[PDB]
Amino acid sequence: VKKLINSQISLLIGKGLHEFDSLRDPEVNDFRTKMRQFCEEAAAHRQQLGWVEWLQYSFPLQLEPNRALLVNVKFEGSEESFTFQVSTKDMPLALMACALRKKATVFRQQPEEYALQVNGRHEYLYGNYPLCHFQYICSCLHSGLTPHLTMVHSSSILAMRDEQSNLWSLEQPFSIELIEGRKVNAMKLVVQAGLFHGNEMLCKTVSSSEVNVEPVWKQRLEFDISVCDLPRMARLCFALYAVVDCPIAWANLMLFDYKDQLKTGERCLYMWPSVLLNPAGTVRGNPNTESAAALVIYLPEVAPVYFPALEKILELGRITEEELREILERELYEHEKDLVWKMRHEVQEHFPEALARLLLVTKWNKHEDVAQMLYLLCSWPELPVLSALELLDFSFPDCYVGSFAIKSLRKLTDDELFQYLLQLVQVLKYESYLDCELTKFLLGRALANRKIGHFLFWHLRSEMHVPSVALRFGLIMEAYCRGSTHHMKVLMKQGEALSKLKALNDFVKVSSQKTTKPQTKEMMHMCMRQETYMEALSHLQSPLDPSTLLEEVCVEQCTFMDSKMKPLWIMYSSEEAGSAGNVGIIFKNGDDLRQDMLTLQMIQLMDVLWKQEGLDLRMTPYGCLPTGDRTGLIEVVLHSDTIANIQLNKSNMAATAAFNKDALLNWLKSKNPGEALDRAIEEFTLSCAGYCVATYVLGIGDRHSDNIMIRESGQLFHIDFGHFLGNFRVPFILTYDFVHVIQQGKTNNSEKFERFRGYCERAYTILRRHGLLFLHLFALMRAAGLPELSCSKDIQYLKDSLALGKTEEEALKHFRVKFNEALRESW
Numbered sequence: 163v164k165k166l167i168n169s170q171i172s173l174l175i176g177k178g179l180h181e182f183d184s185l186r187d188p189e190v191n192d193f194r195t196k197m198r199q200f201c202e203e204a205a206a207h208r209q210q211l212g213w214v215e216w217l218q219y220s221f222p223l224q225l226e227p228n229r230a231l232l233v234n235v236k237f238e239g240s241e242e243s244f245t246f247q248v249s250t251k252d253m254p255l256a257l258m259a260c261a262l263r264k265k266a267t268v269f270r271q272q273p274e275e276y277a278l279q280v281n282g283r284h285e286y287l288y289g290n291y292p293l294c295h296f297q298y299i300c301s302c303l304h305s306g307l308t309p310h311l312t313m314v315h316s317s318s319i320l321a322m323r324d325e326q327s328n329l330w331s332l333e334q335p336f337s338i339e340l341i342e343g344r345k346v347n348a349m350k351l352v353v354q355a356g357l358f359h360g361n362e363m364l365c366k367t368v369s370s371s372e373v374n375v376e377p378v379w380k381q382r383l384e385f386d387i388s389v390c391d392l393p394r395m396a397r398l399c400f401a402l403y404a405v406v407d408c409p410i411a412w413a414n415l416m417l418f419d420y421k422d423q424l425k426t427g428e429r430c431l432y433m434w435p436s437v438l439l440n441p442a443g444t445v446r447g448n449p450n451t452e453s454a455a456a457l458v459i460y461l462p463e464v465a466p467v468y469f470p471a472l473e474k475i476l477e478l479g480r481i482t483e484e485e486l487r488e489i490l491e492r493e494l495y496e497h498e499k500d501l502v503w504k505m506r507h508e509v510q511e512h513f514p515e516a517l518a519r520l521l522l523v524t525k526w527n528k529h530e531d532v533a534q535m536l537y538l539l540c541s542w543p544e545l546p547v548l549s550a551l552e553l554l555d556f557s558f559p560d561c562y563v564g565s566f567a568i569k570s571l572r573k574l575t576d577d578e579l580f581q582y583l584l585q586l587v588q589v590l591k592y593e594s595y596l597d598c599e600l601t602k603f604l605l606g607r608a609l610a611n612r613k614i615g616h617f618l619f620w621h622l623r624s625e626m627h628v629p630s631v632a633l634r635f636g637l638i639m640e641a642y643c644r645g646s647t648h649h650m651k652v653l654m655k656q657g658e659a660l661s662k663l664k665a666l667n668d669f670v671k672v673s674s675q676k677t678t679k680p681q682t683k684e685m686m687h688m689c690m691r692q693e694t695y696m697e698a699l700s701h702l703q704s705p706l707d708p709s710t711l712l713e714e715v716c717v718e719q720c721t722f723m724d725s726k727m728k729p730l731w732i733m734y735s736s737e738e739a740g741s742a743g744n745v746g747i748i749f750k751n752g753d754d755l756r757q758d759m760l761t762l763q764m765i766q767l768m769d770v771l772w773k774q775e776g777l778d779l780r781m782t783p784y785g786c787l788p789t790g791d792r793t794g795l796i797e798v799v800l801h802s803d804t805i806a807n808i809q810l811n812k813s814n815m816a817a818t819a820a821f822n823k824d825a826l827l828n829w830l831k832s833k834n835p836g837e838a839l840d841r842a843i844e845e846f847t848l849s850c851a852g853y854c855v856a857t858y859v860l861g862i863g864d865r866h867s868d869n870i871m872i873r874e875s876g877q878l879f880h881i882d883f884g885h886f887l888g889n890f891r892v893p894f895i896l897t898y899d900f901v902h903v904i905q906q907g908k909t910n911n912s913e914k915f916e917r918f919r920g921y922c923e924r925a926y927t928i929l930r931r932h933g934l935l936f937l938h939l940f941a942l943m944r945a946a947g948l949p950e951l952s953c954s955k956d957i958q959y960l961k962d963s964l965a966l967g968k969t970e971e972e973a974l975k976h977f978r979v980k981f982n983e984a985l986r987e988s989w
């Protein structure tokens with residue numbers, strides 16, 4: 163029933179669908195109807211995909227950014243398996259042919275009709291790629307583990323598909339009437355009002371008269387801009403404050419509605435409390451109408467006037483110094499801005515990637531200059547993904563500009579889209595209207611790729627406790643669910659597990675304040691062994707990675723950290739996945755995990771960029787996902803310990819040492835006996851270089867032995883990223899205990915140590931070349947509202963860390979100075 167689906171969506175998104183209807187908002191109504199149709203169309207297309215296309219939708223290939231290997235292969239309806247010897251260069255089809263030939267000799271009598279499932283995972287190997295190009299195979303080679311695969315027939319894939327079925331004449335100056343305000347404060351009240359096009363003022367800000375602290379102004383506010391010159395995306399921004407400065411509240415609104423109609427007449431603005439003008443703030447009023455200060459205004463009846471259609475703009479806009487033009491096209495002066503604008507045609511024809519620079523010189527407060535700009539924009543060639551990411555910033559607020567950026571981003575691969583998904587979702591917070599090209603783009607890509615769809619859901623769901631985005635995000639999630647009834651239920655199962663983990667964690671938090679850790683742990687186990695917990699916590703797809711299946715919860719192995727927020731350690735097993743099904747999740751409640759996730763995703767991007775240049779620094783890109791209000795999950799890295807635990811140098815252990823500096827190397831020797839030691843020291847060296855460069859570039863501070871871990875393989879990785887971008891200029895960090903392992907436990911080993919410096923330098927030089935990508939992604943991330951990513955000074959930290967203004971030679975000299983200073987500081 164449509165009624166059952168509505169109650170399921172309401173529970174899933176954390177907001178009743180009845181709340182949307184109660185708003186009596188035609189913009190909400192049209193978004194709902196329009197996006198419902200769009201997502202239902204995509205669902206209809208999905209249910210008729212061919213079986214290979216269904217594999218591409220549900221299990222998109224996990225590929226990496228000659229040698230002999232053994233692979234174990236079984237068929238779906240059998241316990242019997244065959245271990246084959248194949249090559250890393252061999253394709254899945256050859257492996258499937260071997261499997262079918264062996265089955266033919268066992269059962270006594272077409273490879274193209276099959277796909278290879280990774281046992282107990284929603285992950286498949288298919289396509290014309292050598293086995294070593296698959297992430298799963300690549301992972302198996304590095305850990306030494308034997309790949310375990312299942313031959314799955316096209317009819318079984320089709321069965322999965324089927325079961326998952328669903329104007330320019332108005333020359334008068336712009337003016338408003340400030341009628342009256344509301345709510346208490348300590349002084350006089352002043353309303354500051356400015357017209358903005360993104361971060362840029364369209365004219366000077368006008369302030370009304372001072373009135374004593376239900377204030378009544380009934381004052382006319384006149385602006386230094388003609389009504390005809392208001393750009394389509396013009397924002398009227400307000401700041402209510404007190405004066406003897408005391409900030410109280412702010413509110414913004416678009417001057418044109420979602421139907422392009424110029425707004426008239428009376429508007430009640432439910433204001434948001436302050437941390438004066440906030441142009442990047444939402445243009446929707448505070449939903450807490452009970453307690454919020456309100457400002458009533460009047461938009462004079464200029465008479466029904468709409469913004470001119472594209473056909474009108476283009477009609478109007480249709481109507482040796484080349485040297486200095488080039489030198490500034492790779493902050494600028496007035497004569498330089500005039501050069502760019504005069505030669506705008508030369509920008510379009512010979513420097514199309516300089517569109518951003520031309521957009522920034524355009525006079526957005528003059529309709530003639532805007533029409534001239536829009537005329538070139540509508541015939542502008544599509545730009546690279548990198549250029550388009552810059553155009554998504556609040557610095558380019560125009561709707562046509564926004565639409566052009568999306569058009570250039572349509573060529574993003576699913577892998578690239580996934581890499582930038584977090585930032586694209588954040589950009590939604592800058593959107594002026596509910597129905598927009600970004601939302602339609604995201605929803606379309608989410609419905610065409612189940613992994614994208616999973617993370618789009620979680621990035622929206624995890625901010626439902628934020629009133630400024632709850633309506634927009636709730637509406638997007640509802641549209642998504644209309645497009646995928648099956649995935650909605652899959653996501654509901656994840657939500658049921660998370661609700662139980664929150665209840666369990668609250669119980670642990672209370673109990674641990676009264677009894678011992680073994681007693682709270684045994685009480686935790688009794689709670690988990692309740693039928694409703696065993697059921698809710700088992701048989702789900704991991705919110706951290708939908709390809710990871712969390713099958714049977716292993717209660718005996720579950721525990722908690724008897725410190726700070728008391729995070730839970732939840733272990734799982736899967737008889738079908740074998741050793742690969744042994745996975746864990748950390749549930750933590752009380753900390754905002756958004757910065758943690760951003761830091762890990764930036765490190766993961768670094769790893770991708772390094773790997774693209776043939777550099778594998780053996781990183782550990784473990785998952786981190788906010789799921790709710792100060793709630794989220796962390797993927798467990800098994801067979802790892804903290805540096806602090808190893809450094810304790812406890813007795814009656816294989817790691818005990820004569821000197822504390824040897825504890826780490828002795829631990830590595832115990833985990834890697836004989837010939838295996840050399841591979842472990844190399845794993846340590848590579849990862850140490852990766853994380854040294856990563857933490858320096860990102861300005862990750864407060865690094866100690868308690869937030870650095872080591873895998874038994876020798877790989878080093880970081881945890882608990884509470885601080886970044888130097889928000890306590892953090893220098894490069896080198897640790898003597900780590901120098902000791904790199905140097906193979908020798909006091910003097912300049913051969914090994916300088917090979918490590920070379921890894922650092924190469925890693926650093928690679929990231930420098932992609933400096934712009936980091937800058938564009940961090941600029942979009944400013945929309946998130948993270949306290950450590952709030953201004954130009956936070957972005958400046960990255961420019962400085964990557965030394966982007968300098969030449970590669972100058973940058974490497976500067977890096978060598980910082981590395982050498984870190985070497986002297988290391989004892």
Ligand SMILES: Cc1csc2cc([C@H](C)Nc3ncnc(N)c3C#N)c(-c3ccccc3)c(=O)n12
Nearest residue numbers: 722723729730731748797798799802803804881
């Ligand atoms: C019980 C528990 C709940 S939460 C928690 C975290 C950690 C460590 C510090 N952190 C990570 N451990 C593995 N994978 C990760 N992704 C992280 C993180 N972040 C350990 C713990 C202590 C000592 C040795 C091995 C583990 C631990 O027992 N817990």
